[PDB]
Amino acid sequence: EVQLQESGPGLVKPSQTLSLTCAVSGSSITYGYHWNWIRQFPGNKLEWIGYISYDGSVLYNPSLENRVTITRDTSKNQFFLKLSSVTAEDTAKYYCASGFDHWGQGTTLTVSSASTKGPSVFPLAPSSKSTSGGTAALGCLVKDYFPEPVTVSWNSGALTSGVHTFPAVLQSSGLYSLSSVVTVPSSSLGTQTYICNVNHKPSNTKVDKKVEPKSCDKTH
Amino acid sequence: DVVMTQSPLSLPVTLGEPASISCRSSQSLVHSYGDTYLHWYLQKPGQSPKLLIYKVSNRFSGVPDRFSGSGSGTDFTLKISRVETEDLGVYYCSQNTHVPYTFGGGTKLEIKRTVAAPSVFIFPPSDEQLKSGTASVVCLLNNFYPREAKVQWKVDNALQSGNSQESVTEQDSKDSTYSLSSTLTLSKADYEKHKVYACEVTHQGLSSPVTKSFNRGEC
């Protein structure tokens, strides 16, 4: 059975040329397959890009035909996608496939002019009106980082129950933001300590943020 | 381009019970040489699509017997006789009869459960963030079902538009609920123009909209 493995640069800038490689195992690309490139946008919509055939024949999506080139190297059993003049809208996960029978695991590609930047981490403070003997919520806002991903844990991994870490959103600034929250007993506030551990490997940033109630006295 | 339309957008299912989803094309998918190149896939989070049914009704090698496709021309249907946990995910249809080859928008199968109203929390911007010149106001909707939920921001009772973003979690593996974050983003200067910040939440589990609010500076 055919096996496919995508590789790519991960990040490219607007106007540049994207180049992806698909390494094929278990089958030869000179046999009767349509070697497809397909991409999946954030939001999960799928788009067929084009294919190359056993004899080097190609077919492209007319919407991309002016920017797309699919080629191959039969000697190392690979084929390639070249996408010119990319913009942020070409950000997607790119798959290669044998027809549509078998797909690779895909390579995530981001197009952006943004510079590497570690997150600012802000507290989502527990409300001082949390229902007594009830449940409180607190969290961390992980704002303005690039590129993805960040990781978030609570109490160095010891706190996992009730945690929700939301998917990142891309802001109009070109930087990402996400929140991570947790629900805990109201009676635990001020006796238990809550710390969010945020790691952003692309910038070698590590931040531990203790989340506390905000001071409610007018005089403090 | 041939438009592929899948419905429903999401289908609540129960383990051990049947499921049925539809795929419709803007024109016939019959190819000039007789075959109908209509296929069905299943995709799980972070994973690539996997072929289930090819050419309308043919089970791909390895696919369980409980899967079956049918239909013709412009109307197609995938059926599961008895839904299993492994069948949860997003189902896609595609066509390569006509160039360009096109995909449907997907149909998610989610676990059905009892209605659960969200717990609602509002968080003001931290003083730390404010010193930096921006104000993020966050509204949390915790552990609700079903997915459908409306969050409206009101600033001094003026409804906000065009300045917020929402994110949602995947359905929880333990209790089959969703959680949702809504972030209202303002410059420090705009934030300081107003006093009352509220998020109003509407959901099937709430007999009346829930509002959580705070006054800028208190606490």
Going through B116-209 in order, the beta strands assigned E by DSSP cover 119-123, 134-144, 150-155, 158-159, 164-168, 178-187, 196-202
In a domain, A28, yes or no: yes
Selected residue of A6, A124, A130, A163 to mutate for chain B interface (largest B Cβ count, 10 A): A124
Residues 14-33 (B) with a CB less than 8 A from some CB of A: none
Question: In whole angstroms, what is the distance from residue B101 CA to residue B1 CA?
Answer: 8
Task: Provide CB contacts within 8 A for A68, sequence distance 6+.
Answer: A49, A50, A60, A61, A81, A82, A83
Q: What are the chain B neighbours of A212 within 8 Å (beta carbons)?
A: none
Same domain, yes or no, for B88 and B149?
A: no
Nearest to A201 by CA among A140, A117, A143: A117
Question: Are A90 and A18 in a shared domain?
Answer: yes
Structural domain ending residue among the three candidates B111, B131, B165 = B111
Q: What is the 3-state secondary structure (H, E, C) of B19-81?
A: EEEEEEECCCCECCCCCECEEEEEECCCCCCEEEEECCCEECCCCCCCEEEEEECCEEEEEEC
**Boundary-marking domain end, from A49, A78, A111:** A111
Task: Say which CATH number the domain at A73 has.
Answer: 2.60.40.10
Are residues B87 and B135 both part of a single domain? no
**Are A103 and A189 in a shared domain?**
no
A220 lies in some domain: no
CATH (domain of B73): 2.60.40.10
With H, G, I as helix, E, B as strand and everything else as coil, classify residue A203: helix
Q: Is there a domain that residue A148 lies in?
A: yes
Task: Please check whether residues A171 and A102 belong to one and the same domain.
Answer: no
Do B91 and B161 share a domain, yes or no? no
Residue A5 and residue A77: Cα distance in Å, rounded?
A: 11
Mark whether A87 and A150 lie in a shared domain.
no
CB contact under 8 A, B39 and A124: no
Q: How many domains does chain A have?
A: 2
Same domain, B13 and B107: yes
Question: Is the CB of residue B128 less than 8 Å from the CB of residue B151?
Answer: no
Same domain, A192 and A94: no
End of a domain among A61, A93, A111?
A111
Same domain? For A76 and A100 the reply is: yes
Q: Please tell me what resolution, in angstroms, this structure has.
A: 1.8
| Same-domain status, B39 and B127 | no
Q: What angle do CA B176, A103, B169 make, to 5 degrees?
A: 20
Q: What is the 8-class DSSP label of residue B130?
A: H
Smallest Cβ–Cβ distance between A137 and the set B103, B121, B168 belongs to B121
Phi, psi of B127 (to 5 degrees): -60, -30
β partners of residue A200 = A205
Does residue A96 sit in the same domain as residue A11?
yes
Domain membership of residue B126 as a residue range: 119-215
Candidate from B39, B105, B169 with C-beta closest to A100: B39
Asked whether residue A217 is domain-assigned, the answer is no
Question: Does the residue A46 lie in any domain?
Answer: yes
CB atoms within 10 A of CB A136: 23
Are A204 and A181 contained in the same domain? yes
CA distance B83 to chain A (A): 23
A184 to chain B: closest CA residue:
B142
Instruction: Note whether B8 and B107 are same-domain residues.
Output: yes
Q: Are residues B129 and B82 in the same domain?
A: no
Chain B partners of A178 at a C-beta cutoff of 8 Å? 167
Final residue of a domain: which of B76, B111, B146?
B111
* A122 contact residues in B (CB cutoff 8 A): 125-126, 128-129, 136
Q: Which residues of A touch B138 (CB under 8 A)?
A: 124, 139, 141, 179
Mutate to test the interface with A, among B101, B128, B151, B185 (most CBs of A within 10 A): B101
B139 at A interface, C-beta within 8 A:
no
Domain finish residue from B78, B111, B144: B111
B168 touches chain A (CB under 8 A): yes
Contact B113, B176 (CB under 8 A): yes
> Residues B186, B149: one domain?
yes
For tokens 């540049």, name the residue: A16
Please indicate, yes or no, if residue A174 is contained in any of the structural domains: yes
Co-location of B106 and B129 in the same domain: no
Whether A125 and A105 share a structural domain: no
A200 with A158, same domain? yes
Chain A closest-CA separation from residue B50 CA (Å)? 7
How far A113 CA lies from chain B's nearest CA (Å)?
22
Q: Do residues A174 and A114 make contact, with C-beta atoms less than 8 angstroms apart?
A: yes
Task: Order across the sheet with B196-202: list the strands.
Answer: B158-159, B150-155, B196-202, B210-215
Q: In which domain, by residue range, is A99 found?
A: 3-111
CB contact under 8 A, B138 and A139: yes
B66 with B94, same domain?
yes
CB distance from B183 to chain A under 8 Å? yes
| Solved with | X-ray
What is d(CA A153, CA A182) in angstroms, rounded to the nearest whole number? 11
Number of structural domains chain B divides into: 2
Minimum distance, in Å, between the CA of residue A24 and any CA atom of chain B:
16
Which residues of chain B lie closer than 8 angstroms to A183, CB-CB?
119, 142
End residue of a domain, out of A61, A91, A111: A111
Whether residues A133 and A69 fall in one domain: no
Contact B136 A48 (CB under 8 A): no
Say how many C-beta atoms besides its own lie within 10 A of residue A155's C-beta. Answer: 16
| CA dist., res. B138 & res. A3, Å (int) | 45
B90 interfaces chain A, CB cutoff of 8 Å: yes
Chain B partners within 8 Å of A102 (Cβ): 51
Q: Is residue A71 part of a domain?
A: yes
Give A170's contacts (C-beta < 8 A, 6+ positions apart): A42, A176
CB A46 within 8 A of CB A38: yes
Query: φ, ψ for residue A76 (rounded to 5)?
Result: -115, 15
Task: Provide the phi-psi class of A214: left if phi over 0, else alpha when psi is between -120 and 50, else beta.
Answer: beta
Among B121, B127, B169, whose Cβ lies nearest the Cβ of A166?
B169
Residue B143 backbone class (left: φ over 0; alpha: ψ -120 to 50; beta: rest):
left
User: Which residues of chain B lie closer than 8 angstroms to A43, CB-CB?
Assistant: none
Contacts of B96 in chain A (CB under 8 A): 48, 100
